[PDB]
Design a protein around this ligand. Structure first.
Ligand code: FAD
Ligand code: CL
Length: 381
């Protein structure tokens, strides 16, 4: 019989940040998650996530990234959990053969961000361990880095509960019942109501937004990462090896320096198996590609980090058709906020999105420019 101000469905990356923002302002909040956040069934585990600022995917992403960065620095000062390490982030690819690299360089020029430009052997000289062809060029952002995602979520969750937020774990929301002046969620453990609703179920948005009369294409992808025994004298954060996102002949890869001897972590971005969140196989290696794709890159570009596989993890991307996020009010219900399809690049923005989501649920508007994320745009189809 407890009526909330706001109910958040899915307390993951976006959800929990949104809950922290709401609780911090005294808004009576209930956060309902299918599991017990942070956990390893969604897309926030794997320990680390890259945060970059020269976002060539859209000028609106830059301010969002820059504001999110400031929010991560604030979070770092408020909790005892480790939030961010300034490893810096390196981007490289074939000179003149990478829209990604070129768009990154343009974004940095356009937004006056601080970056170092280098190419060929300069890359290989600056960062021992990296071996690229002399025809490769790179842009290095020294002030961006790595976020410890599980710590971020755990910190947001602890800060929000200390301010009165309620978290209902291991409870799957099955249906929604929206009325012009209140929202209701349906779960096996009971029904709950509030004045506002935030929906951020990650991969599961591809299966439950239909319950909100929304028919938006969202395709979940199985995306693995691998930790490899590496030459600590080259790939250790301690010796300044950077976080990275690069473009090679067969696609985009991303990785992290070895932290405390955990080994270099790498992930293949351009490819992932299409799956259903409820049946995805979360065992690293069940497929031969899981590991072969990562070693194909390592043996060629960072041969010193191609050692024994120390650890594997399986996580999910949820793509929209244009691969841009969806952050907006529900087209038929102004008391419902949607956050979905972060298509593999949304964690860095989660602190900012948390702010956008709390602004939208409380006022129906946000001070951030989120036009390219409209739920009514045509590219969504
Ligand atoms: C998978 C992946 C993603 C990724 C990455 C590497 C890999 C292997 N590297 C990134 C990087 O370097 N930088 C970056 O900015 N992003 C990177 N990503 C993407 C990022 O992790 C994702 O975009 C982000 O985590 C998406 O967050 P979202 O909040 O959408 O998803 P979630 O964290 O999975 O949380 C969803 C929660 O909702 C709950 N749930 C699901 N269904 C229900 C129902 N029915 N009822 C209630 N709760 C539900 C989940 O349990 C989950 O907690
Ligand atoms: Cl995603």
């Amino acid at each position: 019989s407890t009526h909330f101000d706001v109910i958040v469905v899915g307390a993951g990356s976006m959800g929990m940040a949104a809950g922290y923002q709401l609780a911090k302002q005294g808004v009576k909040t209930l956060l309902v998650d299918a599991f017990d956040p942070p956990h390893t069934n969604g897309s926030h585990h794997g320990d680390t996530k890259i945060i970059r600022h020269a976002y060539g995917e859209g000028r609106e992403y830059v301010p969002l990234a820059l504001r999110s960065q400031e929010l991560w620095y604030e979070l770092e000062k408020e909790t005892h959990h480790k939030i961010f390490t300034k490893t810096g982030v390196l981007v490289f690819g074939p000179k003149g053969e990478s829209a990604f690299v070129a768009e990154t360089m343009e974004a940095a020029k356009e937004h006056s961000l601080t970056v170092d430009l280098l190419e060929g052997d300069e890359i290989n000289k600056r960062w021992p361990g990296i071996t690229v062809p002399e025809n490769y060029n790179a842009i290095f952002e020294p002030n961006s880095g790595v976020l410890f995602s599980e710590n971020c979520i755990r910190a947001y969750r602890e800060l929000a509960e200390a301010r009165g937020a309620k978290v209902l774990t291991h409870t799957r929301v099955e249906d929604f019942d929206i009325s012009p002046d209140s929202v209701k969620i349906e779960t096996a453990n009971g029904s709950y109501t509030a004045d506002k609703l935030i929906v951020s179920m990650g991969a599961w948005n591809s299966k439950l937004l239909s319950k909100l009369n929304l028919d938006i294409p969202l395709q979940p992808y199985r995306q693995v990462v691998g930790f490899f025994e590496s030459d600590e004298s080259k790939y250790s954060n301690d010796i300044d090896f950077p976080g990275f996102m690069v473009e090679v002949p067969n696609g985009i890869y991303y990785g992290f320096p070895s932290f405390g001897g955990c080994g270099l972590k790498l992930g293949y971005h351009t490819f992932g198996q299409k799956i259903d969140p409820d049946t995805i196989n979360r065992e690293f290696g069940v497929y031969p590609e899981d590991e072969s794709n990562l070693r194909a890159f390592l043996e060629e570009y960072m041969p010193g980090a191609n050692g024994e596989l120390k650890r594997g993890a399986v996580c999910m991307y949820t793509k929209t058709l244009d691969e841009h996020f969806i952050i907006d009010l529900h087209p038929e219900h102004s008391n419902v906020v949607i956050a979905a399809g972060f298509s593999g690049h949304g964690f860095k923005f989660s602190s900012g999105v948390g702010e956008v989501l709390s602004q939208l649920a409380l006022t129906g508007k946000t001070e951030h420019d989120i036009s390219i994320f409209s739920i009514n745009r045509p590219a969504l189809k």
